[PDB]
Amino acid sequence: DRINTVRGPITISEAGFTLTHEHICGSSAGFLRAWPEFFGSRKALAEKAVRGLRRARAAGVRTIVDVSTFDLGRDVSLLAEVSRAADVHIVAATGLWLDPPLSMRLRSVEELTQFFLREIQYGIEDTGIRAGIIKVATTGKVTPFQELVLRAAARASLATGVPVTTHTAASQRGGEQQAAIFESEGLSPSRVCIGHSDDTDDLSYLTALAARGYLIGLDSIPHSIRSWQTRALLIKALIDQGYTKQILVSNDWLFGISSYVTNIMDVMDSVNPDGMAFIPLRVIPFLREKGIPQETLAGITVTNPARFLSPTLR
Amino acid sequence: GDRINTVRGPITISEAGFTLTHEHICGSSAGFLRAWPEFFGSRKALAEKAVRGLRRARAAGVRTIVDVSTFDLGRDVSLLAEVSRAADVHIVAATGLWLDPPLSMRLRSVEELTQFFLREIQYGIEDTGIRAGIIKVATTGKVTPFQELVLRAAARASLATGVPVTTHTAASQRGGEQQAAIFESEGLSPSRVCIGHSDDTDDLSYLTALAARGYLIGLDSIPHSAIGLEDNASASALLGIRSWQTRALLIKALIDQGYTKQILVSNDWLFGISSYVTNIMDVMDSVNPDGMAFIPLRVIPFLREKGIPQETLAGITVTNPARFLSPTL
Ligand SMILES: C[As](C)(=O)[O-]
Ligand SMILES: C[As](C)(=O)[O-]
Ligand SMILES: [Zn+2]
Ligand SMILES: [Zn+2]
Ligand SMILES: [Zn+2]
Ligand SMILES: [Zn+2]
């Protein structure tokens, strides 16, 4: 019924057109606070994000899910500020990505479950802002620590109804091992989005996951040696197979980046000047031109994220 | 010249008094104390514990500690300021990087890292206005490419500000020699550098050779010992199984070799720890219930009894830290 955002709870019907995998800033824990000049300034980064969210809004977007975890340097205070100024809802994430510090890597599954629960049930830091999604990430065949993270994420999800969303290497079919771990925990696939799934041409891998009830996160379409149109046709391919209700689409864009080489943000913006508006301005019309009907597109961009984000244990 | 940055502002170096040069309020990770304070019970619980412990150290004669927690050890300078003020003990904060840099640090150039260290020294840490008075760096065995960048940025920051450098070593690996070589290649004076965790080894040839070059020698983990705890693999790995007396004897050894002016002594204690196994703080607190008061209450009398003059012990615990911390270029 209600989804937590960085400005408080909203009803399902208020979410509207939702981008389910995005970032205000891709960074590291404490980094934005310790070295804001890395981004010019905190004000400059905020202003860029407000402009970018208002552009997304004018292209029809009403909500984004920021899947920046603790170790991606999530600053929910920043998220709240730019959400307010852009009038775009932002759902914040708990979980762990691929750069956990020692204080996280040395935790038990039980400890990590408490941490994820605290961010969902109590709030993030001292802000009272509660996470509405759990983000996790794996590499290869899943490390021992990543297995603990996935199990902790399943248990937090099962306690709260909040969904899980993942980082994979699609070229390694990494969703398969993630699914196996989630199902061993008793998690329903309909609570899970297997993400970065547009980085493959292996349709049979995606269909098999969709048939098992997973949400398929076709979430990095503008990250272009495959063209974006090729990635976008995976959306059409899953629709054509009758799995429209399993599709989630996004840009995986960011407004600031420090967890990579300096000035990569500049390179990225020059390649995709549309930013988070790439899905609604380029991918949706491309799909219309391929004959996908309005009702289907609305299903994918409004109905599917609402069903996914609404906390549910059914 | 004669003023040093503390988390309550600049003090003249005559106000530093008895100084523990390698300590921690909390051993953690960037962002961690603010995201998960319940890991330590609560933030208030941790602050209260630190204040009790610092007040006891103060009763025992300690006037200043140097908290050598960096960004990636989860340094929260607001917490340092809160507990410094309440215990009325000076705390010097650190910039630099330890052994757990996140990607956003690991991918930076030497010039970027230099700017980051200079920001924390010359401008302030985060938005607090509190300036670091020391640069902490760390290496393991062979220095990694990234650690080499960190050590060069530290040297450059020190040369620009006069602020000293203090290091983490694996002393069993004679790590200070690789560190010293890099520092000297940048033109850094050894008198601006403390080679830390040097009490982790009994190799007096290694220690005296560094001392002879003008390095400060950090004998900084004296109460660290898992003797009696040999069935505890994690505590043994961290604390070692050499006795505190064995560690303390290195202080007398370096004095006896003529290097009194090169010795810095500390506990390397902490009031909270998240960057290791859960329960390690409780284990440590049972090994050493004196906490940071261990140096003045145990080690100083031990050395006296060996016949070391009071004046020598006062030079080590007061004069050497003052000379080390006073910005000098
Ligand atoms: C921060 As990412 C490139 O895993 O979406
Ligand atoms: C935080 As330590 C054990 O390197 O002093
Ligand atoms: Zn990812
Ligand atoms: Zn992402
Ligand atoms: Zn150390
Ligand atoms: Zn230390």
Side-chain angles (χ1 to χ4, degrees):
Chain A
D1 49 330
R2 294 265 245 172
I3 300 161
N4 285 325
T5 71
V6 302
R7 304 182 298 184
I10 70 176
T11 67
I12 301 310
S13 67
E14 295 177 76
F17 186 162
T18 297
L19 291 175
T20 49
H21 181 130
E22 305 291 340
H23 303 271
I24 295 309
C25 189
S27 185
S28 301
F31 191 85
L32 175 56
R33 174 172 167 81
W35 196 358
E37 295 81 16
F38 183 83
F39 305 97
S41 71
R42 186 190 181 80
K43 180 167 183 178
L45 172 63
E47 290 178 340
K48 178 183 185 197
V50 169
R51 288 190 305 270
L53 285 187
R54 288 171 176 164
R55 192 208 179 151
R57 195 189 195 286
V61 175
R62 292 296 173 264
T63 302
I64 66 158
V65 181
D66 187 327
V67 296
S68 308
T69 50
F70 173 75
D71 61 308
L72 270 165
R74 176 204 63 204
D75 182 334
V76 289
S77 296
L78 175 69
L79 276 49
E81 174 174 4
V82 297
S83 173
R84 175 171 213 162
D87 187 35
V88 169
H89 302 291
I90 301 177
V91 177
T94 186
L96 290 171
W97 182 72
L98 297 174
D99 195 25
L102 270 176
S103 293
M104 291 295 178
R105 304 191 299 272
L106 295 198
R107 305 282 67 86
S108 63
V109 66
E110 291 88 357
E111 289 170 336
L112 296 173
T113 306
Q114 297 171 6
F115 173 63
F116 298 164
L117 282 175
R118 175 239 213 245
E119 297 206 312
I120 296 163
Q121 296 180 313
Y122 172 76
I124 289 158
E125 296 149 331
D126 57 351
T127 66
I129 291 166
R130 289 165 203 86
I133 196 161
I134 302 148
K135 165 69 180 288
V136 301
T138 68
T139 55
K141 311 214 160 304
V142 181
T143 67
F145 179 68
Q146 291 159 4
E147 176 168 351
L148 297 190
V149 173
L150 266 60
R151 291 189 185 281
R155 298 164 190 190
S157 177
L158 288 166
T160 64
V162 161
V164 185
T165 190
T166 80
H167 169 109
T168 68
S171 63
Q172 293 170 333
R173 279 81 172 177
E176 296 180 340
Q177 301 92 307
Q178 295 180 348
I181 290 156
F182 291 142
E183 290 173 31
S184 80
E185 289 282 319
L187 191 61
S188 170
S190 65
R191 296 280 86 207
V192 172
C193 174
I194 304 296
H196 308 327
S197 282
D198 55 310
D199 197 36
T200 181
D201 296 322
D202 190 349
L203 182 60
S204 72
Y205 158 66
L206 304 173
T207 307
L209 290 168
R212 295 164 61 182
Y214 291 96
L215 285 299
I216 307 305
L218 303 174
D219 57 37
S220 306
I221 316 286
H223 294 255
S224 64
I225 54 176
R226 274 156 76 242
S227 84
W228 72 259
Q229 297 94 325
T230 280
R231 300 188 168 228
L233 285 168
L234 295 167
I235 299 167
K236 174 166 185 301
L238 291 171
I239 291 165
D240 283 343
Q241 281 172 320
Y243 292 111
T244 298
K245 82 187 299 281
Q246 310 307 135
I247 304 170
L248 299 175
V249 299
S250 228
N251 309 271
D252 194 25
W253 212 244
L254 314 94
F255 298 116
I257 302 172
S258 61
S259 292
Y260 202 61
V261 307
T262 302
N263 291 324
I264 189 64
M265 187 73 280
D266 276 4
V267 177
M268 291 177 67
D269 286 331
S270 64
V271 158
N272 167 33
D274 294 319
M276 284 184 196
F278 182 87
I279 289 306
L281 298 177
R282 310 305 162 210
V283 178
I284 298 301
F286 170 84
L287 291 172
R288 291 193 201 277
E289 101 188 27
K290 296 308 170 186
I292 312 302
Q294 166 68 16
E295 316 74 54
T296 298
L297 299 172
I300 288 166
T301 53
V302 177
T303 311
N304 292 353
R307 177 186 347 106
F308 183 60
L309 290 170
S310 184
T312 322
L313 289 171
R314 287 276 167 275
Chain B
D2 75 329
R3 285 154 62 80
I4 64 152
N5 295 318
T6 74
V7 300
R8 304 183 289 189
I11 68 176
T12 71
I13 203 63
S14 52
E15 293 295 325
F18 187 158
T19 301
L20 296 171
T21 47
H22 181 134
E23 305 292 340
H24 306 266
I25 298 309
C26 186
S28 192
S29 299
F32 188 90
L33 174 53
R34 294 191 180 205
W36 200 358
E38 319 86 271
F39 183 87
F40 307 98
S42 65
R43 186 187 180 87
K44 187 183 190 351
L46 176 57
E48 289 177 345
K49 182 180 179 198
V51 165
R52 287 191 298 273
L54 291 166
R55 288 181 175 165
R56 293 194 232 285
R58 193 192 194 282
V62 174
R63 291 301 176 262
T64 300
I65 73 172
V66 180
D67 183 326
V68 296
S69 312
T70 52
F71 172 77
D72 60 304
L73 273 169
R75 175 205 62 201
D76 184 329
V77 289
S78 296
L79 178 69
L80 274 50
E82 178 179 9
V83 303
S84 168
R85 294 179 190 284
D88 190 29
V89 171
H90 300 295
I91 304 182
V92 176
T95 182
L97 290 170
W98 180 75
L99 298 167
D100 195 26
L103 283 172
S104 294
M105 288 294 181
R106 300 202 293 279
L107 294 184
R108 303 283 70 83
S109 67
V110 68
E111 297 88 359
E112 289 170 334
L113 292 176
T114 306
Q115 288 312 303
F116 176 64
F117 301 162
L118 288 169
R119 182 222 214 254
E120 298 205 308
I121 297 163
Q122 303 185 301
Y123 171 74
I125 292 166
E126 296 148 327
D127 60 351
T128 71
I130 296 164
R131 295 179 185 181
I134 196 161
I135 307 153
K136 165 75 174 283
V137 302
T139 65
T140 13
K142 288 171 42 228
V143 176
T144 65
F146 180 69
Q147 287 160 3
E148 176 170 338
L149 297 186
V150 172
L151 267 61
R152 295 183 185 281
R156 290 167 195 188
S158 181
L159 285 167
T161 62
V163 165
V165 179
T166 190
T167 82
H168 170 107
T169 66
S172 66
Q173 313 301 114
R174 304 190 283 268
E177 294 174 356
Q178 292 64 42
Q179 295 172 350
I182 294 166
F183 294 139
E184 283 172 44
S185 78
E186 294 281 328
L188 187 59
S189 177
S191 61
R192 295 279 82 212
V193 177
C194 175
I195 307 295
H197 302 330
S198 286
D199 54 320
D200 281 351
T201 183
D202 298 303
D203 188 345
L204 190 61
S205 297
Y206 163 74
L207 297 175
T208 62
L210 283 171
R213 287 160 74 183
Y215 287 98
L216 288 300
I217 311 305
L219 303 176
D220 59 32
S221 302
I222 314 298
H224 292 212
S225 181
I227 298 189
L229 310 173
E230 295 89 359
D231 65 334
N232 182 336
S234 69
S236 294
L238 170 69
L239 300 180
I241 49 182
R242 283 155 71 249
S243 70
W244 75 257
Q245 292 97 328
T246 288
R247 297 179 174 272
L249 284 178
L250 290 167
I251 307 171
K252 168 167 156 53
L254 280 178
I255 294 165
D256 283 346
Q257 292 286 295
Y259 296 107
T260 296
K261 291 180 186 183
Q262 308 313 129
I263 299 161
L264 295 174
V265 174
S266 226
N267 311 272
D268 193 27
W269 217 244
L270 313 91
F271 296 110
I273 307 169
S274 62
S275 290
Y276 203 49
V277 300
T278 306
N279 100 343
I280 190 67
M281 183 78 284
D282 287 334
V283 169
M284 295 184 62
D285 282 338
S286 64
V287 167
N288 171 32
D290 293 306
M292 289 181 187
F294 182 87
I295 293 301
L297 294 186
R298 304 281 180 172
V299 179
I300 294 308
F302 173 83
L303 290 180
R304 289 183 203 279
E305 199 281 329
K306 294 300 180 187
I308 291 140
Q310 158 72 13
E311 189 195 16
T312 301
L313 296 178
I316 288 164
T317 54
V318 178
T319 311
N320 293 354
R323 186 185 341 108
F324 178 61
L325 295 173
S326 194
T328 316
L329 66 81

